[PDB]
Amino acid sequence: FRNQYDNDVTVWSPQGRIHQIEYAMEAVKQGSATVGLKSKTHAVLVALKRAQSELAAHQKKILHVDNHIGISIAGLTADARLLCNFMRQECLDSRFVFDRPLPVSRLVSLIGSKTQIPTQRYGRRPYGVGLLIAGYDDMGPHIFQTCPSANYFDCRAMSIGARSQSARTYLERHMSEFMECNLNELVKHGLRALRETLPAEQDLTTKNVSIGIVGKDLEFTIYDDDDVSPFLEGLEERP
Amino acid sequence: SYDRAITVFSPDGHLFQVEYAQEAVKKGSTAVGVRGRDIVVLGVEKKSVAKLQDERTVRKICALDDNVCMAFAGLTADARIVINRARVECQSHRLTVEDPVTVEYITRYIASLKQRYTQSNGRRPFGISALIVGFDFDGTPRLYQTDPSGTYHAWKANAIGRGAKSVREFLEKNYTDEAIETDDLTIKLVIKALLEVVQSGGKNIELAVMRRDQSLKILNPEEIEKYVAEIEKEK
Amino acid sequence: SGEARKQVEVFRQNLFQEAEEFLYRFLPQKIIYLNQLLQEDSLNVADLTSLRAPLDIPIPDPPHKCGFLPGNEKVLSLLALVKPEVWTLKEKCILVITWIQHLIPKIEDGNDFGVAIQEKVLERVNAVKTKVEAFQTTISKYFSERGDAVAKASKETHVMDYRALVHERDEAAYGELRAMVLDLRAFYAELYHIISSNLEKIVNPKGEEKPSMY
Amino acid sequence: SGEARKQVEVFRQNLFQEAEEFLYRFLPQKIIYLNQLLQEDSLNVADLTSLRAPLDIPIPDPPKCGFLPGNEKVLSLLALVKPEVWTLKEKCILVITWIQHLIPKIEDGNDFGVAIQEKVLERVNAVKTKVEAFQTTISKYFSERGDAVAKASKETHVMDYRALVHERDEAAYGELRAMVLDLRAFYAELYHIISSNLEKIVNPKGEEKPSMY
Amino acid sequence: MFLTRSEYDRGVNTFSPEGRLFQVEYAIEAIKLGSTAIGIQTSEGVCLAVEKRITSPLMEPSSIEKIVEIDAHIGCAMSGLIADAKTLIDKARVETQNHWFTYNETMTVESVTQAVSNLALQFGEEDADPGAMSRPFGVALLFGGVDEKGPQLFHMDPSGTFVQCDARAIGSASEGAQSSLQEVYHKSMTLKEAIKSSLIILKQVMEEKLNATNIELATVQPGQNFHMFTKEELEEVIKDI
Amino acid sequence: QPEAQAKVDVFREDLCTKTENLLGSYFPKKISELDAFLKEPALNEANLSNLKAPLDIPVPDPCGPVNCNEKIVVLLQRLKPEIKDVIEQLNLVTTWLQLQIPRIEDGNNFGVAVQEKVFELMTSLHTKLEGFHTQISKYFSERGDAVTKAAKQPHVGDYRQLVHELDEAEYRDIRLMVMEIRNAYAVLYDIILKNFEKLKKPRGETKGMIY
Amino acid sequence: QPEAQAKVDVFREDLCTKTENLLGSYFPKKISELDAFLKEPALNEANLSNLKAPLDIPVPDPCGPVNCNEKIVVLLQRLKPEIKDVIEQLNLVTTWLQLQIPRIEDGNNFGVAVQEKVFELMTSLHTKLEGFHTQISKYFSERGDAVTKAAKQPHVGDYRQLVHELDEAEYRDIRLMVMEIRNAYAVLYDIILKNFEKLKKPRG
Amino acid sequence: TGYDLSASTFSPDGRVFQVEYAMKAVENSSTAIGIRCKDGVVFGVEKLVLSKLYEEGSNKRLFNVDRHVGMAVAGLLADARSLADIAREEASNFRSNFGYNIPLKHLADRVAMYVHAYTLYSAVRPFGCSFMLGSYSVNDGAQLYMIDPSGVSYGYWGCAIGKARQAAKTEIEKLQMKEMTCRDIVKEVAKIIYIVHDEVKDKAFELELSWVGELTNGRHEIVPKDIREEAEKYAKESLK
Amino acid sequence: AGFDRHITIFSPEGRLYQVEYAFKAINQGGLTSVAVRGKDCAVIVTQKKVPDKLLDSSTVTHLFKITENIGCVMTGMTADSRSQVQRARYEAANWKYKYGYEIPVDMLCKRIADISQVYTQNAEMRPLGCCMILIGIDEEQGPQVYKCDPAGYYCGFKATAAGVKQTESTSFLEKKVKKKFDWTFEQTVETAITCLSTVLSIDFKPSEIEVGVVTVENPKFRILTEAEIDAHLVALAER
Lengths: 239, 235, 214, 213, 241, 211, 204, 240, 239
What we know:
The structure is cut from a larger assembly and holds 9 protein chains of 7 kinds.
Chain C: H1 2-39, H2 48-51, H3 73-103, H4 113-155, H5 161-197, H6 199-203
Chain F: H1 2-39, H2 48-51, H3 70-99, H4 109-152, H5 157-194, H6 196-200
Helix pairs in contact in F: 1-3, 1-5, 3-4, 3-5, 4-5
Chain H: H1 17-28, E1 32-36, E2 40-48, E3 62-64, E4 69-75, H2 77-98, H3 104-120, E5 129-137, E6 141-147, E7 153-155, E8 158-161, H4 165-173, H5 182-196, E9 205-213, E10 221-222, H6 225-239
Antiparallel strand pairs in H: 1-2, 1-8, 2-9, 3-4, 4-5, 5-6, 6-7, 9-10
């Protein structure tokens, strides 16, 4: 049967696996894909937004935590809104207390600690949002992904979301080129990688793509529907 | 499956425990309210004397405050808690805003208390539906009804409790501006309607009227006898 | 292949149109026709003695193969009216089962309530199928049983219980046919009611995709 | 007496070795050989008319039968199938004994492996019943054909009885073909379940009490 | 072949194999139990319309209140459980007022939706506060108002997600009404056309024949504040249909 | 052994290819073939009395070869291959799903469950078709026994009727089997196609490492 | 009653003593014997055609005693004693375990549960071995019926084949039973030995 | 059987299965080894590279719990990072109140008690991480301590955690570590890490090595890349 | 059933099965501990099994010092044992602080035992599965040996044992007390070692046994050094 061992985060399975945490991890797959890549001078997040209906506007997939840090959500939007608020307050706190932009890595550690507590204690469900966090700090451009499981990873590039393996595949092959890339080239590489996730009939449009760029001189900026047009125009056609 | 906890929502989005509490109200004694132009009349059936039981203790119709009166159908004990809590609020509003509570404010307060009970597991919804009758500062008569769910609606006339469906049909047909024209006529309409559902005659109906500034008056059994007689004679 | 989906989709669409039509036309018409067959005096015979059919076997008395002993004609004409009906119902019931089976949705962890409505309706359609199939078996059983009794009664002319058995077997079929025409009529009726009452859930089990929470 | 455990343990090690050889040798070889019998022209005859075999019973005409032989084509094919049916049955039994010998001491927890073994046992049991039945059908075919022929000869007039003998033969041919795919599929399904889950099947529980207690 | 086991549906705070959090999904289904409400946002203003669903003639029509004013600039049409709506309309009314007190300005429609949404998100037991409903809220609100960016209509769902919608229908006939809305909506339509179009769609979806009593209609054109068409005004528009 | 690895690999490749052919090509075509077959008049006979075949058995106050009902034997010839084919295809689909079941693990049971559930319906179709096969065998034996009984006892009229009834019943049943065979074919496609992603890849893509 | 207490105690002492003998000494010995028997050539005959034995029924263009297949009967003579021995030994273990089952109490049930699980398996072997016994009985009746049918109806060639087939099947079945009997004895040692502490002392 | 569902429950035979189930979690993780030699303690972790995309020198499984002590973890990483935080907090407190660097034996005990608490209550699951702590202080000496999910803490001359724990222990056993010096051990740890790694099952690994000892002046520190590179070469050559 | 599975529920025959299950856990450890009280000395001996050569022998001990003059041997789950020792050490100090004199051994067992009853009566926690035997010298009553079990029973014994062979060990000790000869320090230690050895059939070497003694002449609990253990062991073999 094995229906048992899956009811709560507090029950270890006979083989060492906490099933609810794994089930939570599945939530990220349900969400629309997002791709994050880094260059020696800039970090970029690109997202494929989805719309309930033609009349409805596309959802926000990229959110600004701070001038130096921004996140893209894949998964339940609610968990993301809650985590983002925690992150924003933690960043605001550092500026008031130490007058320094919070090191991006430190923030991810804090998101991990908050995220882990639901996993070990009966009660709150594990957060089911998967987050890609991008920021430029003194150490440099940084791209980190956070699983619904609290584990976090530092990545040269990553795509989280539905059909994200295809994007990871493109990113791995063209990865070396990214480090020395110019900003236009880096966003262009990313837009192509998310294109792979899209169904063959669908095409990247100004409406479904959101680009967020943070860099030594650029505060995190989410280029949106009409401002993605410069980055999108240079792109070619589906392979 | 989806009926054991108030918090759980059924596939199809029905919260079953709240609906079940509404079933409890149906098991309770009938109550009818008619909003006459100058009088609001609230009438409730009395189950039985039991011979050895004093009737003063059992009172379905109660006055929340000078201008607001309430009748209830449902678990009797819950009503006593809600009635008491409403009375504290009526007096507390008078303390806070110096002004007598409007009928609707009391209805909203009573409703919120009930909703609060439905919202969290660990508390059972109060199994009472109430008819709150009152006259506002403008002096317009107002009749409102509340349900275990916490929905409040204003009804020109309504019946809650067992047989409510039958009386409400009777009221829909019988109620007219002409019927509410005379204060006696209004009392007659409620008595006639309760008669439809009451197994016995006038012996089993307790009725009360609140006039524009007068306090709630529970009609004496004799006064009820006179009214039933006029109705029976006219029949 | 999209083309393979298309070929099944063509069949699925045809079944839907037939099911809708069968529900709004054949099922109501059949209820009326069957009620008439029941109303007819032929299936309403007051005395079973009239159904008794001649068994021309000579009895043994103190001082050859019997002449042809025909089947109870009255029962046979009734059987001839019933046999088409048993098959129309079986086929129409089968059309409905396929319609529901096709409509069942992709298996999912939850929101499987619509599937449940489909399952309970299928359980009724299955129960009806077994009962109706049995009716067809009974017709053959009667012929074999009546035949065996006729054979035994001629072979041992002395035993009269065998003669009674033939009369009883005929009596039972008349009684059974009356019940069977009643059941087919009832079955069309129950099927129409379960499907009509629960049509929405059966047609669209899981409903509109949940607005994005993702 | 430890002597008894040794005898069983020697039996277990023999069974373990036999199973490993069967999985990596007898099982793969049989899968290829059976597919060849399946793709052999004999089991793929397009027109069943070829299978029809002579029935020497005189038709009744207006004014005892000679020896009636079995359909040789079916008999030759059956003669090939009977060894194959038995070899699968024998091998299935050896595998079942090995899983059974490897089930561990019953305990309240750490029973995931025991459950894997039970899932595998469920499949082996399903296969055993199906394969045993194949053996039964072979015998039934001869008996049913034999009675049918007897009935046809005893009552020459009935012609459906003659059709029945022919129909029984056609079915056996269709069944033999289905049986060979089934045996091949069975060897294959067994190889896949045992191979995929061998680690857990061999060592279901392992040691989970360390310094905790 | 039916696998209807479920068993992960009951109890929020449980993720189904496939990570679907079914209780929240079921709550979204509840809004279908509610009366249909349709909102069209046009440059001239945002119009909101709802079906009252009056059970008995004796019930006073005014009391049913499926369109309410959060503040002069923003109004809300709600479909779903009436009671949980009352709490959400209240958080909104306090938050608009709190913004006036703290910042002496009028909240944009989007911020007000974010504010009510934040309350809705709390159903997950996100906070340790005792006074938070465990169940996801069962109401969907369409919030329409004239702000700095001009007429805007945002739709909120029991999940707590909110999005701007040029036209949306929430309720029993939302599927189908939305389809019709898609065909009729053109960005250029004036509010007068939208009011007529929305009422045409409602007449089709509603079981009862449209009458001034059965419908509630409101508009928030940029110069004017939230306005609820009175029976006389409603009679004029329905007559045009 | 390498020969072993290759031998298993060939079987695995062929099975996966054959299933794609059955689902992509054979199943759509079969539905069409059956659909034309059912539309054809041979299995659309309004009056079963027409199906009746003359019995020459003499009526009492010497029996010639009593032929079978040609109309039914003709229909059987068309139906019998179909019953066997659907059985073969059901064996193929069961092995295909079985070879796609992952190594047992505590988690990711959904999908392994969908696979097992799909197997159950398919095994059930297999049982229903073997049940149909049994019915076909019974027709020849029962009609034959009936004819024999009628011949042995010319006096019993009912036995003569039984022969006609068994024949009339078979045509009706045989038409139903064809309709059912089409249904089984279509449902198999719907069950697999609708739930294909889980059936083909039950565990799902690798998703990070908690450990 | 004191004499009765001696009578019951003596049965209890004997049951416990006999069981240790079966597991400690008889079961190892039987597994060796069954191993020796399977190795022997009579039950390892590659060509089942050799097993086929002549039927003298005259072919149709008066039948003498048609003897039974000596090879099968010879094998049955070796197999049938073994089948019976295990059925008896299984009773000894089934009774022994039941005596070890303790007074029913609300808890500490695991142990009673282990005893029940082992009991179910031993009972399951009993059903299989009884099934083997039924099969042995059927062969004699079925083979006789087939020879009789063939002799009664010489015209039918299939009946002659059926007799040959029944014999072939029996040899295979008997061979399998020897293998199953060995396995059934061996599994019994594994279940009882592995769970012996709980079976002997379920409560703890 | 409902005995295994919670840690509050005890099985009829006396075993708390949920703790044992948690111990199985560590076996899922990759092997990590710590060897204590006379000069100091060297820890090594084979960190599987799941994807080329992940940055090197990240996803670290070796954490510094205080200036003088280092922690190597195996098991669910999330719990480990959280346990590391508990340890760091405990170390800070010992310095804040008692005014000196925490003795490692005490640190292990305090963290173990925290880990054990989870074992008793039913609200919280046992932690799924097994970790090793090591420190060198001139007064205390070199100390390696390993904590199981149960909360059992013991001092190990050499220790291994993770999927290949049994295999690694056999290799570690033939080392005569007490006599050996810290620099030599780093090569040896690598040899063992390479031997245990299964190339077929695990595509590739990056060895992360850390050490504390007289050479590091009692500060746990990541081994300098020159030393690590030399060791990785020694290991491949030995693997032959 | 279901009568077991929660400590709070009582069986239909009032047996609180979960507490009984805990006593089983002490045995699961596989180690036995014997304590014997002499005229002037109290000794606790326990079997020390080191599973791996790598483990440092010094770290593994079941003998702990609750206070300078009270010593305890805890048998059962190792982790639970350490937890109880800390509570005992805290309780022992808290007595000195509040009452100004060293806790009497009986009172330490009583406090520790009473804590165990709370676990036995409250639903969330599990009875700790360990048994603690305390040895101390009280000036008024001479040497004292007390055992507290997971139930909360706190009896004091002239001699006692805990672990897998407790029943056998008790029988051996019972025979020796019945033939009372009184016990000198040497005899008290010798009796303990002979008992553990005979029940286990081990024929112990100095490394396998840990022996702790409290004497009136030197009241402080001391864990004997391997050499000291060897001396007693050698004498036992010699005679």
